[PDB]
């Protein structure tokens, strides 16, 4: 179709969101690794 | 081999702490 969507937007996360995301992923890995390895 | 995995994960978390303290993000407007 030629007509683009009027309701088309772009996701965006700043650096602070990145740091929270990376910390959450690593902290969860630290906590759960011992149990997964068992 | 597990001791290697645990140590890297602990160091990885510390690495993120160092980045967040020093490589902060300049404030935007309105915020």
């Amino acid at each position: 179709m030629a007509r683009p969507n009027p309701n088309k937007q772009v996701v965006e996360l700043n650096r602070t969101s990145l740091y929270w995301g990376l910390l959450l992923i690593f902290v969860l890995a630290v906590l759960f690794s011992s149990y997964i390895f068992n | 081999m597990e001791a290697l995995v645990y140590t890297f994960l602990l160091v990885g978390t510390l690495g993120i702490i160092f980045f967040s303290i020093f490589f902060r993000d300049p404030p935007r407007m309105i915020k």
């Binding site: 996360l13 650096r15 969101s17 992923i25 390895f37 | 081999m1 597990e2």
Partner: peptide, 27 residues
Amino acid sequence: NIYGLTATALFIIIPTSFLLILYVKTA
């Protein structure tokens, strides 16, 4: 520990890389 090791590895690479991609595209 083959399944235990791979699960830990994927849980790190897959989300962390995904977050990094979004940050790059934003900036």
